[PDB]
């Protein structure tokens, strides 16, 4: 089941989107036997313009270690790029540090508990060092090193959320919503649902981001009017609510 | 989310407006695999005569590190003098310091983290390190030095709000009403809805800077009157609020 | 006579050759008035393949001090690349040390004495500085960076050449002269005279390169042979010579 | 003169042959403008038979630093075989604490004089971290790092044939003699010289091999005879001088 435990700690990182459910569906395919030539997915892999150049890394890193017959593969510079830690030289002696640990231990478990206790800096440059074959270490410690750097971007992920909602600061707090509100009718738009709901569905998300620009237009500062910051946030509650319980419609 | 939680920050800072309006939009393209040519977005956002240069700099930063293929863009000289720092040594040191610590992240929160314990002059200037490839970090960590910028200019503009309501200077504070009512007319002017609304809005709009004016041209000093001043705010007041639920009228 | 002196500095750096007299000559027109377009000119430089990338930032640097009317020229990305440091902190706390002081100068001598007394690492990020415009510094500073820079390259270069002729090991010893016998071979048969000597000089230089390749595939070790090693040298020695008096009959 | 001082050390270490003119001249190649397409010249240098992994590996990566257009090349895996150290965690402990002291130089000596304190393991995994983007140096740096690797193993390349001669064992002792005399026969066969001396070169050469073969199957140990030894020896070394001469006749 390390196919499985692997898949978890790998999609997390990625954003919610179209490029999710493909990226997940090619994990399937390449952990199922149904493994495609790999120059033509990591090319696929390159081209996607959402991915920050970190995550695209690991996605493009993972799929080497499936991939059997090297010596005949190739290493792409995005993936170099990425993995180099920036070339810092003080972080990359931690990665040293850790990749003799990892080089010991082939258990899967054994290789994330050990890596988990360095920087999420090290786990970066390090897990170059096994792209790179700068270094070695057998496939089930490798993705124990992935998931260690996955959990560290993935307990990051959660945690600025954490910190963005509870912000004191009230100017971001109500800018927040307006991007939240065209973020989730952006969803909507983008997936067309199969059913008559997509004319419908893109109506009152065309409706919401129709007028939460308007509402930006406008502002709500309490300088750029005497009392209208409040009425505005409350129609974009109701739209929230409105968007919301539209999801599970077509469902 | 990391795309969402730098649009947060990004867009508090910007005034409201209607290029408010067409950057987020901008971004949204940029931010969803839409990317235009970034010579000609950088371009338009070069001409926009309302965004101060330093807010200017950031949304010029933040496209170039969405675009991929490096050496073939083109570093603007605005971005530059923007993000310069006033080329002071002082505080660029504490930028060298920051820019120390950020290469070791690779996580968003991580670099947004360490980047607010540094004054807001510092990362203007760490910011523009990474710009000019003086430096080199991560995208995630560089967001969170942008966002670490953009609170803490958005702060800057809450706490300015703050302060000049509660300022006890009573010049000012007539003042301060003139000003907001005719930023408050003005919103509805070039804001011409579809509906017939927008002709009522313009006259109802127009009273108020038809009459604002002549409020300032006779003046609200106590020695420029003998008790006109109290009954010449009230006026503003009944139109601060007729122009208050006109909003919500075309909404 | 700065432009002078400058022109020593920046000249010593680059190697012999075609390009060091191409780049001298058009250093004298933007030197002495003739400043043709500043495009064209870094567009040549950047294509030149011998220069280095760091010795090819120089040249590209110094240009741009002479050029006027900034805001309409363009920062080009091989200088930046080259001059940016290796984008460390350490060194690079050390050039905004150095910023300091250069800030506080307006003479040339002045910003080169202090400037040659930190490590020439440092003056290649600070250096960066200036061109970047996270600086800014009077121009007969900016070169006093400039040639503290060349100062400290051209006394390595010849450091370089002392420690190299007098190292003790023979097997470079040996192959350091059937290169250098090539090199002085190929500056003749690419510097194709006027004269009638250069078929002349051609024969005698294609000579010693169609003998050196000889001599390289025999080789000269000491246990590739019973003694060769000993008469091979004998031969070069009077090629070297022989050449060494070819040079100047056309002169 | 750089490109000079690196073509003394990088064919220092090539063994000698018609491999060796081969490179040399495709280095002057590089070394002069003349820069064909690095993919091509890569895969010529992959199929070549005599070169060692380690030693295959610095002409790889000594090309790569030349060609410009980074982002577009292609890291060949061989390089990075050779290159990686045996994956050693120890030594590449010292290639990072060398490569953090690199990467704060920018002079060609200053990276050589420091990457000789240590010791010729390291460089090797160093120069690993350089050719795989890990780490990030200077042009000038990194060669300045070859030539440490290079002349490290000319020095061991000489060390060698300072013992080998020396040696006290007379059983290797008397057979250096065969194979020494079989390679300087072998190095006429294959240079085939365009005059007649062509013919008459290879009946003696293969004179010599012909009977050198005959030696070893008579063989030369004290048990094998009764004082034959003594006269075998003796032939070989009229031989040996028979093809000394011979050499210098062609010339």
């Given at each position: 089941s390390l196919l499985t435990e692997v898949e978890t700690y790998v999609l997390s990182i990625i954003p919610s989107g179209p490029l999710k459910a493909e990226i997940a569906q090619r994990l399937e395919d390449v952990f199922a036997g149904k493994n495609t030539d790999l120059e033509v997915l990591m090319e696929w892999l390159k081209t996607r313009?959402?991915?920050?150049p970190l995550t695209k890394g690991i996605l493009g890193f993972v799929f080497t270690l499936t991939?059997?017959?090297?010596?005949?593969?190739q290493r792409r510079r995005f993936v170099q790029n990425a993995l180099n830690?920036?070339?810092?030289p003080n972080n990359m002696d931690k990665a040293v540090k850790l990749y003799r640990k990892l080089k010991?231990?082939?258990?899967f478990h054994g290789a994330k508990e050990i890596s988990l206790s360095y920087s999420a800096g090290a786990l970066a440059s390090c897990m170059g060092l096994i792209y790179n074959k700068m270094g070695a270490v057998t496939t089930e410690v490798a993705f124990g090193l992935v998931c260690a750097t996955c959990e560290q971007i993935a307990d990051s992920q959660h945690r600025s959320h954490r910190q963005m909602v509870t912000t004191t600061n009230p100017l971001i707090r109500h800018e927040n919503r307006m991007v939240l509100a065209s973020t989730t009718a952006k969803a909507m738009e983008q997936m067309?649902?199969?059913?008559?709901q997509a004319a419908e569905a893109m109506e009152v998300a065309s409706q919401a981001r129709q007028m939460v620009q308007a509402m930006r237009t406008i502002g709500t500062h309490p300088s750029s009017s005497a009392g209208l910051k409040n009425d505005l946030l409350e129609n974009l509650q109701a739209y929230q609510k409105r968007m919301g319980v539209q999801m599970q419609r077509f469902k």
């Open positions: 313009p959402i991915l920050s991939v059997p017959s090297e010596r005949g593969l830690g920036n070339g810092d010991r231990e082939i258990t067309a649902g199969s059913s008559e």
